[PDB]
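User: As part of a screening pipeline, I want to sanity-check one entry by hand. Below is the sequence and the SMILES for STI. Please return the complex as structure tokens so I can compare it with the automated output.
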Amino acid sequence: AMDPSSPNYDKWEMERTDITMKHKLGGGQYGEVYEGVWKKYSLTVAVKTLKEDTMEVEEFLKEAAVMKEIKHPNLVQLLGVCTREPPFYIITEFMTYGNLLDYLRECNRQEVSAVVLLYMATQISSAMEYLEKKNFIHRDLAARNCLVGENHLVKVADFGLSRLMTGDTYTAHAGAKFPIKWTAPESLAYNKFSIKSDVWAFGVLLWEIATYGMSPYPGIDLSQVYELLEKDYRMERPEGCPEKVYELMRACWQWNPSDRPSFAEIHQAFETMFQESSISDEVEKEL
Ligand SMILES: Cc1ccc(NC(=O)c2ccc(CN3CCN(C)CC3)cc2)cc1Nc1nccc(-c2cccnc2)n1
Ligand SMILES: [Cl-]
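Assistant: Here is the complex for your manual check:
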């Protein structure tokens, strides 16, 4: 596939010996993803590989194919693949600060101020606006699936955490493992996923951002979440959150999917949200 004249030529295919494989990334909270070094550039990269004899070879190849079709500053950047023969690799850039959820929980709040949180939320909506217009659905948007780079740059990723994750984030539901607290009602009850269920998840992600990474619906048992949501319960405006930001969360959590804003509308909302007063002024007024 590396031969220019070949009808099977793929500019993404690269020589895997160009990469030095290091240890598994983030301990193992990403599964078979390893830190690697692209020798020629002395560049640290992230390398996703396939688990020992699994039946997700087609899903792996499908993911590689989809990544070749997307290019956006806020989506993890594909650097190359090694899929001509085993072992299959998907290589992407390495993001210095790791996942957004841990970053929010461990950051210097003086640096990562309300302005920066808004910037992070806006960048995420930009990536989703892109996927939206290209007719893609994310299906598992949450802070744990976003990465943070230099200067608070945020990129939306998809680590296929469903089964890798430990703890209560993902629980048994509809024959699969669902991160219930980020799942839209129609997804929970009718297994219907769409860009609108991503919007509902984005609203939960916005709440994660606004609380520096608190876990949603704290103290509520998952077995009562649907009934509560059906009777219009929603997490209250969190401490210090600007009213306008909370209104956007509420819009994302409309019961009817069709009533939720598009990501294009969400991104625009962010860009013009604080034209009469700054978010800093609102976070003071609120407190
Ligand atoms: C090495 C790799 C291989 C594949 C991917 N893939 C994606 O991140 C991704 C994002 C969006 C889509 C779009 N897709 C559309 C269809 N729907 C259903 C799912 C989403 C697909 C793949 C990322 C990576 N990068 C990655 N993976 C795990 C951890 C890290 C990582 C960790 C710490 C610091 N820097 C990087 N980096
Ligand atoms: Cl899709």
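Points to compare against the pipeline: The pocket of STI (ligand 1) is lined by residues 25-26, 30, 33, 46-48, 63, 66-67, 75-76, 90, 92, 94-95, 98, 136-139, 147, 157-159 (CB under 6 Å). The domain at 1-94 is CATH 3.30.200.20 (Phosphorylase Kinase; domain 1).
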